[PDB]
Design a binder for this molecule. Sequence first.
Ligand SMILES: CC(=O)N[C@@H]1[C@@H](O[C@@H]2O[C@H](CO)[C@H](O)[C@H](O[C@H]3O[C@H](CO)[C@H](O)[C@H](O)[C@H]3NC(C)=O)[C@H]2O[C@@H]2O[C@@H](C)[C@@H](O)[C@@H](O)[C@@H]2O)[C@H](O)[C@@H](CO)O[C@H]1O
Length: 587
Amino acid sequence: EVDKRREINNEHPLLMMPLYANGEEFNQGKYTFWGGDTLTGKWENIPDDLKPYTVIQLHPDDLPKRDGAARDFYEHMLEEAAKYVNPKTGKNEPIPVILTVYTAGNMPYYTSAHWLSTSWIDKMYQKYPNLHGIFSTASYWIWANDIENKAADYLKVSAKNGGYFIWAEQNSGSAIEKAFGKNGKIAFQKSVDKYWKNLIFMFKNTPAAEGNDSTTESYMKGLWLSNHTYQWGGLMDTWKWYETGKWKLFASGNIGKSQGDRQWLTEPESMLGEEALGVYLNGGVVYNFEHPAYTYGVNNKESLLFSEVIKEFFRYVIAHPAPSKEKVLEDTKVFIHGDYSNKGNGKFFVNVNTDREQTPLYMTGRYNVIPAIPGVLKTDKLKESVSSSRIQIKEITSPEFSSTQARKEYLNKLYPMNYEGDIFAQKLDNRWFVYNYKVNENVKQTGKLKFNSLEMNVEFEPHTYGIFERISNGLKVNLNNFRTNKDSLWSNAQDANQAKKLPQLTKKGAIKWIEEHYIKDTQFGEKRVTKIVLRGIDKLPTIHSLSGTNNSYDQPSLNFDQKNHMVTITINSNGNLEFELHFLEHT
Ligand SMILES: CC(=O)N[C@@H]1[C@@H](O[C@@H]2O[C@H](CO)[C@H](O)[C@H](O[C@H]3O[C@H](CO)[C@H](O)[C@H](O)[C@H]3NC(C)=O)[C@H]2O[C@@H]2O[C@@H](C)[C@@H](O)[C@@H](O)[C@@H]2O)[C@H](O)[C@@H](CO)O[C@H]1O
């Protein structure tokens, strides 16, 4: 094995920071990115605590579809990255880079990436120590004839140089299964047998109308646990709102795929944190987002989605490393072997742990994410692990998985019910993770969670998550319900018919909207109420270390009921929030 250029694991997670080439400006002789970020300015802006865990991902976007364009742009940017000097210290501190090398099947009618040879990639790895990996993304919808063969070559050239091959794909049309050899294209399967330590496989949740979120995430987890990938993660995409035909938040009616640029702006900010918790809580460590102008920002400035949700979430996963492969294996009671494409795809989990076909969220954490691998693969390396001795490995064609009811009956015997209420909750060590799982319905949810004898009841509005940690002196609370008001994007439309007919915002228009109405002059959402009730408390708790999004929260209200040894905490907020409550239990 060649020494790895970087570590990627629970203690060293990875946030990919996409920069998309501006092809129109490239035609004018300029080297720029859509949204106005610069490579150097963007990197400088990344908080110093995050720099060790963040890598710039160049994407060739609409560069000219002909030989040389992508090489020219990428070499320019690799040079800029290589020569970067930290202005505080004066030292050359090369910026770490990942190159997008494969997308849209590398069809010459879809992408400039077609004209990036493996030879060139090898040359760039050898020239630039700061090139840490290469990225393939979004070919599930155009599964080119040689895609598996090329993936093998990308993984091999990465292993040769100590870099990572990172592949983000969703299981549309059996893509994940095909990648590993389902239809007889086995070059990548064979490559993985040798080079899996240099592979990162991620979901890409963009094609949301097809409902493959749960099954793709299951595969990503299972591939990792069975040593077919070094680590896993997910690309979480606000374009899902377009794919599913949603418009104004909570409105009725469906507008289809008709208002793209308005639609990718509308997903609630905090909902990206809810999606990301599914990666974290299941041992994933790599995160990426689209649309970048909304999820990260523009003009070397952080969007509020980035600053108030993604940045704080990512800091959390650095401070509290995700469960290790060993831990996740120990916790796994059931491991599925077989093809979700033959068992209804995402429908497999509907009314098991998802509430509907088209969602990136879960309705219970009881089973967390059940890991799986495609039928074409073997569970040999899984069984070889010291930590897999108590796992039931089951064929997907088992009677236990034949129907929704059979699945729950079988799983319920191995995963005990561990909380009450119709809400998402999952426990890790001394921490309850909770979120309201509604996507586009304005319905409050409630749960009852326990820390031994201490009872905690919560009431959450949609697009609200919380992390509640029992600490020696009380409870640490992290809460995020940040959701700005996007109604202005949908003004002049009183129903779905009118919304579908709105003038197109356009790509440039959406970037301008972000600049003039999101980065500044932001239409913040209304403060909204979260309730937390603790039962089994000795005396009125005290509050400590209260902070959160500026101007986003009222002072929490504590109402202690001595007779009943309970406190009711009422929070009115819209943002991220954190505090500690100090108390003793009543005995
Ligand atoms: C399968 C699917 O859902 N979509 C295919 C397209 O892939 C992505 O789909 C989005 C719509 O759901 C959208 O069109 C994405 O591209 C726009 O947004 C990105 C940033 O998020 C860029 O600004 C693009 O320039 C912009 N496109 C346009 C025309 O303005 C699109 O994602 C992009 O393309 C894919 C292939 C991949 O490279 C991604 O990394 C990249 O962001 C697909 O592009 C389209 C082509 O006809 O076909 C859809 O079925």
